[PDB]
Amino acid sequence: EGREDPQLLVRVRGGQLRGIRLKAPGGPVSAFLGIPFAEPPVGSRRFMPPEPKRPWSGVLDATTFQNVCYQYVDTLYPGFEGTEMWNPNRELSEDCLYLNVWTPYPRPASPTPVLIWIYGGGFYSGAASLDVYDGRFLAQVEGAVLVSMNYRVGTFGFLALPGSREAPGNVGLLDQRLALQWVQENIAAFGGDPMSVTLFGESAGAASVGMHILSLPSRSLFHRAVLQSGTPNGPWATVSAGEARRRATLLARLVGCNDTELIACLRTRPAQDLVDHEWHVLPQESIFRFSFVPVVDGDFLSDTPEALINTGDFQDLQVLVGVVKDEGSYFLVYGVPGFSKDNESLISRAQFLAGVRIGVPQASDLAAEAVVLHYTDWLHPEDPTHLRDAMSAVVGDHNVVCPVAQLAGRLAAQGARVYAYIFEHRASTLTWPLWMGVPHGYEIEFIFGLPLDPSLNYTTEERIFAQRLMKYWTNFARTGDPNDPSPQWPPYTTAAQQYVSLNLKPLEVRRGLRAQTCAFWNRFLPKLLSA
């Protein structure tokens, strides 16, 4: 100490930290990156619930992002920014339980509302250090205290032998919870208000948020919640204990392995070997399905998310939820024949029927025909453009839009204050093809205010747009109302089903979140599948 920037030295429960002055377009922010919050979940701790980080001595340097949790690395389009932006940007390691904090510079004088980000990536990938999660803009422009944590994904985070001691399941979610607890105890040191904590996340991050809402021990740890393009209910975010057990033992076999001994063998395997077989345990050929996700353990999750939302009391809850215009397009190039980023992906009626079986992998023959019947345009049954887009809609509706619809409806019917949106602006910088429209994941860069960074080549209108969204999100975190005390954003209600469009145009209000089609997925399909 002595000749150091006095405004970057901070103490937390575990010890002393030195952070970094970062440049944002409109001025400096304080960043504290790679703060450990758990004991490394390595060796005999693999598959185990996280234990809190033991205090250290000296000044921990907190000026760079820490390791990314060990994970699958995408290879579909090597070199292509559209896929690479989501790939790990620091060394892969099982020792990865660290978190990040951005705050105004100098730090806030009064207690500031805290946003906590939880990244998505199907519960098998992701990292808080990605460029699209850069907190400097929300910190600098809105004066937010922003926190984001790494959590274990894949087998390391979610492989479960339900009931066992050595692999209880959901430890990735416990990593998240431990970091929420860390914020409660320590965020005041940075000027953050522990009594105003809003969770937000996208895709599996969104599902994670939803699960914290549904799990009592997390409830005391936050006050409001944003769920972007993801839900804890729906077909991909959880598996039953039986299915978890089945996938865990299959994967053990594949790598050469009484729960205790099985798990102990798994713990002897190099991280990379587990990753190399993680995609080989899915029950059917599929897209938008992930091998190791939260399990219904009857503990963290006392029952299925469907049951928990259908019956829970949510009077104290304020939630913001929404979707992008083309939730499904992204996923089609990852396993539906006929789809590519490199061409128009016009497909035949045959490819559409085949796409449906892969897109709705759990459907019986009858259920799948119902899907094809509903989505077919009977004026143009064979039109390759309609079919391409209908395949997208099937995947988007089944996995995101309708699970979101069910969530908003149940939450509202049961006391929560809900705001709902659809994001419809396509980044002028998007590198995916036009046919994909506004794909899943591509609102995030706007919510975090990347267009304010002049070197990123967004349009002036995109810059203004981003600022608006930053205002909505931070207003909602601040007050539980996106609106600024300009057209208004009404709550979503069972009776009016109102939501807003988010684009370059001023807020426009709409009614019914795919009401008709979602009745099919949410009300009819369940009944049909039995049997």
Ligand SMILES: *[C@@H]1O[C@H](CO)[C@@H](O)[C@H](O)[C@H]1NC(C)=O
């Ligand atoms: C686009 O690419 C995919 C995969 O290479 C291919 O199957 C399909 O035939 C192509 N579409 C057209 C109409 O050229």
Ligand SMILES: *[C@@H]1O[C@H](CO)[C@@H](O)[C@H](O)[C@H]1NC(C)=O
């Ligand atoms: C932005 O535009 C300039 C000028 O064309 C270009 O040289 C630069 O690489 C661009 N940056 C990005 C990331 O698009």
